[PDB]
Design a protein around this ligand. Structure first.
Ligand SMILES: *[C@@H]1O[C@H](CO)[C@@H](O[C@@H]2O[C@H](CO)[C@@H](O[C@@H]3O[C@H](CO[C@H]4O[C@H](CO[C@H]5O[C@H](CO)[C@@H](O)[C@H](O)[C@@H]5O)[C@@H](O)[C@H](O[C@H]5O[C@H](CO)[C@@H](O)[C@H](O)[C@@H]5O)[C@@H]4O)[C@@H](O)[C@H](O[C@H]4O[C@H](CO)[C@@H](O)[C@H](O)[C@@H]4O)[C@@H]3O)[C@H](O)[C@H]2NC(C)=O)[C@H](O)[C@H]1NC(C)=O
Ligand SMILES: *[C@@H]1O[C@H](CO)[C@@H](O[C@@H]2O[C@H](CO)[C@@H](O[C@@H]3O[C@H](CO[C@H]4O[C@H](CO)[C@@H](O)[C@H](O)[C@@H]4O)[C@@H](O)[C@H](O[C@H]4O[C@H](CO)[C@@H](O)[C@H](O)[C@@H]4O)[C@@H]3O)[C@H](O)[C@H]2NC(C)=O)[C@H](O)[C@H]1NC(C)=O
Ligand code: HEM
Ligand SMILES: CCCCCCCCCCCC(=O)O
Ligand SMILES: [Mg+2]
Length: 335
């Protein structure tokens, strides 16, 4: 009949480094029905049992898992999780797939809402990823060895054989160029424009062992373990502090870029979108997403309406802090 969704967890009581690849959280292979998707962080958490091993979880579980497993900062966890949930989760059962569609999220929502999981392309998941191919090429969720080979190449060329912030700057730009040249449906706007810079530093801030204090750099062995195998490095210790997108500004600065996309179903035809969110116009992202939610849920009532209102408020609490203040929207009024 429905769940009453609780407010998000706050930061963990203990925020220092610790062993996260421990005896209680062993890597285990996929079973039938287990879901994995485009996020190596969530994938690894599920394969080590920080999340349900089937890859279906509540927002609350996802937040706590990203904190426990990686020391993902609380507000960043809230912004990412409720974004994912609002667009791609089942608001009634309070369950989100970290990958594709599954009966495990429960009775489907009214169309055009889908609860189809983080795999759904075009509003959250998008193009020019590091180890995943653009949806246009037919698979936006699987690890892609050719792309990981480029990751290794760029690490060799710019990072001494390791992934560091210099490499991030170069790889991000190059991957944008690849999509311009090869993908006629390439989009790099709104949510994707913002998340694409954060994701390039997460390997440095979160996949590098927390006992490394200076010269933070990720080995290709550790990268492959997480990105491909969904496995923590042996004896992996999380970041010694809550962290998220530190250094993403410098990635952009290395190759200034403007939100937009290839126009008119043609390659090498990138047109700027002046209405898109960008890093000095973050609240546009809030407004865009609320708009998208209204398209998914044009006239909700009952538990669905209630759970939408709550989840929108939950998300806003994170957005308000992370974006430095946005006016809360109330598309369905109040409870
Ligand atoms: C990601 O990982 C990558 C890979 O590890 C990493 O890249 C390293 O980046 C650092 C910088 O961040 C590199 O170090 C810098 O190198 C600068 C350039 O070095 C060249 O030029 C030096 C200066 O040249 C002057 O003097 C010569 C005459 O000697 C003259 O011709 C020039 O015109 C100019 O006037 C030169 O000394 C240097 O040569 C020495 O070193 C090389 C080896 O690199 C050696 O072969 C030579 O025999 C000689 O010993 C070289 O040709 C350098 O300028 C810069 O120095 C700054 O810091 C010093 C203090 O240490 C200051 O005194 C100085 O004023 C500068 O401000 C610095 O050392 C490093 O070499 C990279 N490593 C690799 C593997 O490429 C990224 O940093 C990582 N990214 C992140 C964010 O972590
Ligand atoms: C893993 O990920 C990679 C990268 O996303 C995928 O490989 C790409 O596959 C696409 C589709 O097959 C390739 O697209 C085609 O590229 C041509 C240009 O290629 C050259 O130039 C690029 C850089 O500019 C190099 O990376 C590449 O090595 C080549 O030297 C274009 O000419 C093609 O355009 C035609 O098709 C499009 C789409 O219909 C039309 O819009 C055009 O008008 C035109 O008719 C085309 O876009 C792409 O080159 C591949 N890249 C690489 C690096 O291989 C893998 O498929 C993916 N999968 C796995 C499992 O590996
Ligand atoms: C907190 C909730 C999280 C959500 C909802 C989430 C969601 C996503 C999604 C949808 C993508 C694909 C983006 C795209 O294709 O445009 C992605 C990619 C990524 N996520 Fe997560 N993520 C979360 C937490 C984390 C954490 C904690 C980490 C690291 C510890 C992480 C690291 C990454 C990285 C590195 C990528 C990029 C993979 C690539 O480009 O190859 N995420 N995430
Ligand atoms: C100052 C930058 C604020 C960053 C807002 C990012 C919005 C959602 C983040 C999702 C990150 C991820 O892919 O895990
Ligand atoms: Mg993608």
């Amino acid at each position: 009949q429905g769940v009453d969704p609780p407010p998000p967890p706050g930061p963990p009581s203990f925020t220092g480094t610790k062993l996260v690849n421990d005896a209680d959280h062993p890597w285990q292979p996929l079973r039938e029905g287990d879901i994995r998707g485009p996020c190596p962080g969530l994938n690894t958490l599920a394969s080590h049992g920080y999340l349900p091993r089937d890859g279906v979880a509540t927002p609350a579980q996802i937040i706590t898992a990203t904190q426990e497993g990686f020391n993902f900062e609380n507000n960043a966890a809230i912004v990412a999780t409720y974004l994912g949930h609002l667009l791609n989760g089942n608001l009634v059962t309070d369950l989100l797939s970290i990958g594709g569609a599954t009966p495990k999220t429960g009775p489907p929502p009214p169309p055009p809402a889908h609860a189809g999981g983080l795999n759904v392309h075009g509003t959250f998941e998008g193009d020019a990823g590091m180890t995943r191919a653009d949806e246009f090429f037919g698979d936006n969720h699987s690890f892609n060895q050719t792309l990981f080979d480029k990751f290794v190449d760029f690490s060799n060329r710019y990072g001494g054989g390791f992934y560091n912030l210099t490499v991030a700057g170069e790889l991000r730009y190059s991957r944008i160029q690849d999509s311009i040249a090869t993908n006629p449906e390439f989009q790099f706007k709104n949510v994707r424009f913002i998340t694409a810079y954060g994701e390039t530093v997460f390997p440095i801030n979160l996949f590098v062992d927390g006992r490394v204090t200076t010269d933070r750099k990720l080995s290709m062995e550790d990268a492959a373990s997480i990105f491909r195998d969904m496995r923590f490095p042996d004896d992996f210790h999380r970041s010694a502090v809550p962290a998220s997108n530190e250094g993403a500004d410098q990635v952009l600065a290395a190759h200034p870029w403007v939100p937009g996309g290839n126009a008119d179903n043609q390659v090498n035809n990138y047109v700027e979108d002046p209405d898109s969110a960008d890093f000095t116009h973050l609240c546009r992202l809030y407004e865009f997403v609320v708009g998208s939610v209204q398209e998914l849920y044009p006239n909700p009532t009952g538990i669905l309406r209630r759970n939408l209102i709550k989840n929108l408020h939950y998300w806003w609490t994170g957005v308000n802090v992370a974006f430095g203040g946005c006016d809360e929207l109330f598309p369905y009024g109040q409870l």
